[PDB]
Design a protein. Sequence first.
Lengths: 309, 311, 311, 309
Amino acid sequence: DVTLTRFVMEEGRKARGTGEMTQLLNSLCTAVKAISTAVRKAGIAKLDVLSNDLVINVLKSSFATCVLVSEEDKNAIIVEPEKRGKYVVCFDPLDGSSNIDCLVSIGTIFGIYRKNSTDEPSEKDALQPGRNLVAAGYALYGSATMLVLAMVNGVNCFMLDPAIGEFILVDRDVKIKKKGSIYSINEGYAKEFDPAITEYIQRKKFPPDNSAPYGARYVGSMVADVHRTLVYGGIFMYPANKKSPKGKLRLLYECNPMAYVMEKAGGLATTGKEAVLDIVPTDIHQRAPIILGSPEDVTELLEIYQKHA
Amino acid sequence: DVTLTRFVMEEGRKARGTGEMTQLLNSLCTAVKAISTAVRKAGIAKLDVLSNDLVINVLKSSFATCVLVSEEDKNAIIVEPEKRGKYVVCFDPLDGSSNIDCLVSIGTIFGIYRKNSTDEPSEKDALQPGRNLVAAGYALYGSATMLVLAMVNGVNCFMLDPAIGEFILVDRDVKIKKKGSIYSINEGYAKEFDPAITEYIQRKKFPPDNSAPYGARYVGSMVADVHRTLVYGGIFMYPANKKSPKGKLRLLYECNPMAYVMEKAGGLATTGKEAVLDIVPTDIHQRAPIILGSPEDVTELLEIYQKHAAK
Amino acid sequence: DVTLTRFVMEEGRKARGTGEMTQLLNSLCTAVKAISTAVRKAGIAKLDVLSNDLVINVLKSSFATCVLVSEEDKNAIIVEPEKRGKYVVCFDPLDGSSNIDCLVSIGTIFGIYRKNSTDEPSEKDALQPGRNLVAAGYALYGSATMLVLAMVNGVNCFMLDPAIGEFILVDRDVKIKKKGSIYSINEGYAKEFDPAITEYIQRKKFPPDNSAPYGARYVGSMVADVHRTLVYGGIFMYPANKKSPKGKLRLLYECNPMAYVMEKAGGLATTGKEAVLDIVPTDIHQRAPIILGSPEDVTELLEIYQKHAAK
Amino acid sequence: DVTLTRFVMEEGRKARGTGEMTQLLNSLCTAVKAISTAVRKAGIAKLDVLSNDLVINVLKSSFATCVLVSEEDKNAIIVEPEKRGKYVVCFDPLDGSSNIDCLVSIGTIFGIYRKNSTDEPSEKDALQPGRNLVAAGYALYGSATMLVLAMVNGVNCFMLDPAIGEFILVDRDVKIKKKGSIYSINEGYAKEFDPAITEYIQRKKFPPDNSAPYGARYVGSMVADVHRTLVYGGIFMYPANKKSPKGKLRLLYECNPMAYVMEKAGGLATTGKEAVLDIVPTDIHQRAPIILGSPEDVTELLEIYQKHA
Ligand SMILES: Nc1ncnc2c1ncn2[C@@H]1O[C@H](COP(=O)(O)O)[C@@H](O)[C@H]1O
Ligand SMILES: Nc1ncnc2c1ncn2[C@@H]1O[C@H](COP(=O)(O)O)[C@@H](O)[C@H]1O
Ligand SMILES: Nc1ncnc2c1ncn2[C@@H]1O[C@H](COP(=O)(O)O)[C@@H](O)[C@H]1O
Ligand SMILES: Nc1ncnc2c1ncn2[C@@H]1O[C@H](COP(=O)(O)O)[C@@H](O)[C@H]1O
Ligand SMILES: O=P(O)(O)OC[C@H]1O[C@](O)(CO)[C@@H](O)[C@@H]1O
Ligand SMILES: O=P(O)(O)OC[C@H]1O[C@](O)(CO)[C@@H](O)[C@@H]1O
Ligand SMILES: O=P(O)(O)OC[C@H]1O[C@](O)(CO)[C@@H](O)[C@@H]1O
Ligand SMILES: O=P(O)(O)OC[C@H]1O[C@](O)(CO)[C@@H](O)[C@@H]1O
Ligand SMILES: [Mg+2]
Ligand SMILES: [Mg+2]
Ligand SMILES: [Mg+2]
Ligand SMILES: [Mg+2]
Ligand SMILES: [Mg+2]
Ligand SMILES: [Mg+2]
Ligand SMILES: [Mg+2]
Ligand SMILES: [Mg+2]
C-alpha cells in the first residue's frame, strides 16, 4: 500500500528539502510511466526518440535542473535560465536498443547530481565522479514495469501497477547476496578478451575445486542483466576488448548509475583495476569497462587481475 | 487495422471450417490477454498456477477440446463429454520460470492437433509427432505483448494493443533469415557438451574464415530466445547434458510448437540427429534436445554432427 | 466467463450463418472498444468526428457491408464493390452531444438490416421499417462501458472489462419491468406539449389513485435515459414541439434501434399514434416522436391519446 | 502537461506547508484513481463499500488526519493517535447510489477542514461551518474521470489520463457563467414543492417576458448535475419538500463541499433563506435544502422567496 509518491515525499520531509528534488523525482516517475505505456505499445491500433523527448521535457518542467546529458545527444543540454534548478541529470532514455525490435526487456537509467560549480551551468557540471551521486536508478520494461531507486540510505524496488498508474513498494532495502551462481557476459568476444576475463570464464565452467558450474545468462540489455544481478546475485561483465579498448558501456549514464545501485546494495562495481564510482570523467560520452554484482564473485575476478598483475 | 479476431475468422471461412477451431483460437487469445494483464501486475496494489487455470478453463469453455496436456500437470486432462470438441491442445502455460522473479520475458507456448482416433479420448491422442499439428503458437510477454501464430499457410505476428485489448497484425507471412550472426545457448554446461556443440561454439568465437564473431544472447526463457531467433535470425540451442541427458526442453509443449513455427518460417529444428517434428512421443512430458533457427546455421552444426558420426 | 466474442460466434453457428454477419458484430465490437478508450480520454496527456471515422472504417474493413447511414453524414455511404457485403447499417456514432463537454454519459447506437434488393446498393436500401432489423444495439460509455445487443432471440447485456478488452455477459435474456415508477422527459418544452403528454405528466406528479409520484430522471443522452429505462423500468419520452414539430430524435439510428431493443425486452415504443418499428422511412435523416419503456406505462399514455382522439 | 501531483506540490511550496496537507491531497488523488478503475469495472472478467474502504484506508495512511466522516458510517472515525494528523475530512465515497446499477455517472465528494479545537479529536471537530473549509472538491466518473479541486485561490479541473494514471490540468480557473439556460430538479415532487420553487419552475417553462424557456436536465447524481452546472451554467435544486422537511442532501459531505466549489467559482449556494456555507452543523449527517449555480439564476429564485416572505 506504500506508493513511490509517498515514499519520495516522506524522504523529502526528513531531509527537510525545499521540495525541488522531490519535485524532480515525481517528474522522473511520471516520465517513466509515460514511457512504459509507450513501450507496451498502447495505442498501436521512433521509440528511442519518443523516450528522449519525454525525459527531456518532463525534466525541464521540474524546474529542478540546469544541466542534462542524454545518451541521445552529442552535447549537454543547458537549461533556460527561467526553468533552471540545481540538479544535473544523466539519463539513458531507452537502454537496450539492439533488443527493442525483438521485444526483449529494455529500460531507462538515470543519475542525479548536484550543481557543484558556482559558474554558468555547462557540460563540466556533469563530469563529476559517480561517488558524488545524490540519487541513481532505473526502470525496467520487462514482464512487468519496475522502478529501482538508490539513494544514500538504500535501494528500494517499486512495482508499477498500470491499473492506477502508481509504483508500489515491493522490496524494502535491497542487498545483493554475497555470492551468486550466475555469470553475464557476451562470450561472442572470446577471441579478444584479456587474460583475466578468459581465466574467470574457465572457472565458472570448469571450477578447479569441482563445484557446480555457474549458469549463464545474458539478455543483451544492461538494465535487464543488471537487475537480475541485483535480484538473483551473480556477476555482470562488459569488459574492455581489443575491438572496444575502453569498454562499450558509457560512464555517465550506464556505468555510474548502476555502480551506485550495486554498492548501495552491498555489491561491488569495478573496471577490474578501479572502483567505477571513483573515476573522474573527461567526456560526457566516455566509455569504461564494467564488472558488477555479488561482492565475492567480483572480488574473485579482481584477484585474478592482480594475479595477472 | 487487421485484428487477430478478424484474421482467424477470415482464415476459418477460407478453410470452410465449422467454426469449432475458430472458436478455439479466439479462446486461446482471450486467455493470452488475461495472462498478459496478470503478468504486467495490473491490480497488484502464483503466476504459473494462475496462467494454467486460465488456459485450462478457457480451453474447456471453448467446447472445442477433447484432451489437454499442461506442463503443470502430471497427467493429461480429458474434457467432460458435454464440452468435448475434436481438438487436442499441448500447452506450456508460462514458460521461463527462472525469469519470473527477476522480471525478464516469459510467455505461453501452445500446439494444436486434431483427434487421430475413433476411441475414448485419452493421453494417447496427445502422442502425435509435431508434423501432425494444425497450428503452433507463442505469446511473448516482453517489452510489449506479442502473439505469434503458425498454420499450414505461414507465420504471422500480432502485437497486443493493451489500450483496446486487440492483437494487430504487424508482420505478415514471416520468413527467418537464411543465415544469422547471433548464437543462443547456455554455456554453463560446457564441461558437459558433446564434441559437435563444442566445436560449433569455438567456431562462433574463432571463425576459421576470419570474419566477425557471432554475438551471444541467452535470456533464459525459451519464448524470448526463440522469438529473437525468428526475427533477427541466428541460432538457438539447448543440447543434452549430464543433469539432463535427453535434453531439458519438453517435446510436446516446448520443442514441437517452436519447431513448427520455425519451419513454417523457412527455418530448421533438429535434435542433432533428426527433425524434432518427426519424433513420435511416448510420454506427454518427454524431453528432447533442440537446435533451431536459420537454415545455414543449423545446417553448419548438422554437418559437424555428421562429420563426427562419419569418423 | 462468457465473452461477447464467444456469444456471437456461437449464435452465428446455431443460425448456420456464413460468418459475414458474425464478422460484422466482431467489427462493431472492436470499434466500440476503440471509441470507449478515446471517450475515457486515454492518451490525452473532435470526439464526434473520431467516433464516426472509426465506425465507417471498421464497418468497411468488415467486408460485410453494402450501405451505411451516419447521423454525421448528409448522404448514405455506398461501400466500394471489392468490400461489399449483404448488410446495411444505420448508426449514430456518438449520441448525446450536449453532454460531451460536461462529461455526462454518451454512447453509440446501431441498427442492422439485410439488403432487400437485387439492384445497385443505394440509399433506398436503408429505408426499411424498424420491424425489418436483424439486430439493434447500443454501447453506453457511462460509469462503466456496456454494450447491449438485441436479436430475434432476445436482449443481452455485456460489460466491458477494460483490463482485457473483452465484453462479458452480465445480464441474460433481459426483460423490462411491466410497470415502473420513473418518468424521463425534457419538461422545458412544456409550453409546447400536446394535451395528452401534459395530462400524463400531471398524472405522474399528482396520481389520481393517491399513490407515490413517479421520480423524474433525464440525463440528456438518449443512450443513458433509455438504458436506465430498460434496467429500472419506467418510461422515456421525446414528443413533438414547436422547434421540432415532428419530434427531435431520428427514426433510423435513434428511434428504430432503441424501439427494437425495447420490444425484444417485452416493452413498447410508440410515436403516440403508431408503433415506431412500423413507420416506413422516406428520408434517412427523418425524425419521429418517441415514447418507450414498460408496457403499462406506455399503454397508460396511449390511452390518454386515444381518449383525446375519441372526443 | 501540468499534472495534479505537480500542481498540488507547488501550491504546497507557496503556502510553505509542512507537507502534511500536500501529502493528504496526493493520498486523496490516489484513492480516487483506485475508485475510478473499480467503477469502470476493470477486472470484472459491493461498489459503495469498496469505495469507502479505500477512502478510509488511504486517508489514514496520509498521517494527515484525525477525524473522518463518511456518508457510509453512523459515527465519526477518530484516527489512532499514531496516525493522527491535523485535518478533518468529510467525504461521500460514492455519490449517486440510485444510479450505480444503470451505469449512470457517479462520483466522490470531499471536504477538508483544519482541527480547530485543542482537545481530544471527536465528532464535533467536523461540525464546522462550510465557510471554514480549507479545500473541497469532487471526482466525476462520467464518460471520462475528472477531479475538480477548490481551494482559496480558485477552482481547477484535472482530467484523469487513465493511460499513465495522472490527472492533467484542463481548466485553469473555473468561473461559472453569470446566467444559464438549464435548470435541474426532480420534478417528481411537484405536489410537495413550496410556493417559491413552484413559481420558479413556471418561469423556466413559461417565461413571463416571453423569452426562450430553460432546458431541463437531471441526471440524478448530485455530482453529475452539479458538475454540469459549473461547466454549462444554470441552476441545481434539491429543495426541502413535505416528505423531506429539511431537504435530502447532507450538509457535511454533499451540500458544503459543492457550495464551496460554487462560490469559489463566482456562483451562489443557498438554502433559499441562507447561504449554505454559513450554517452551523448540529449533526454529522444533517440534511439541508440546497440551490446552487449561476449567480443570476439563484438570485432570481431568492427574490421569489423573499417575495413569498
Ligand atoms: N525527496 C527526497 N528524497 C531524499 N532526499 C532528499 C529529497 N529531497 C531533498 N533531499 C536531500 O536534501 C537535499 C536538498 O533537497 P532540495 O532542497 O529539495 O533540493 C538533496 O540534495 C537531498 O540530498
Ligand atoms: N480459423 C481457422 N484458421 C485456419 N484453419 C482453419 C480454421 N478453422 C478451420 N480450419 C481448417 O479446417 C479444419 C476444420 O475446422 P473446424 O470445422 O473448425 O474443426 C481445421 O482443422 C483447419 O485446418
Ligand atoms: N452471429 C450471428 N448471430 C445471430 N444470427 C446470425 C449470426 N450470423 C448469422 N445469423 C443469422 O443468419 C443469417 C445469415 O447470416 P450470414 O451468413 O452471416 O449473412 C443472418 O441474417 C442472421 O439472421
Ligand atoms: N498542497 C497545498 N496546497 C494548497 N495549500 C496548502 C498546501 N499545503 C499547505 N497549504 C496551506 O498551508 C496550510 C499548512 O499546511 P501543512 O503544514 O501542510 O498542514 C494549510 O492549511 C493550507 O492552507
Ligand atoms: O551486443 P553487445 O556488445 O553485447 O552489447 C550489449 C549492450 O549494449 C548496450 O545496448 C549498450 O548500447 C547495452 O544496453 C547492452 O548491455
Ligand atoms: O536455465 P537453463 O538450464 O539454461 O534452462 C533454461 C530453459 O528453462 C526453461 O524454463 C525450460 O524449463 C526454458 O524456458 C528455458 O529455455
Ligand atoms: O436537449 P434536448 O432537446 O432535451 O434533446 C436531448 C436529445 O438530444 C439528442 O442528443 C439527440 O440529438 C439525444 O441524445 C438526447 O436524447
Ligand atoms: O431521487 P432523488 O430524490 O431526486 O435523489 C437524487 C439525489 O439523491 C442522492 O443520491 C443522495 O443520496 C444524490 O446523489 C442525488 O442528487
Ligand atoms: Mg538510450
Ligand atoms: Mg544504454
Ligand atoms: Mg508453466
Ligand atoms: Mg516452458
Ligand atoms: Mg454522433
Ligand atoms: Mg444521437
Ligand atoms: Mg456515498
Ligand atoms: Mg451522496
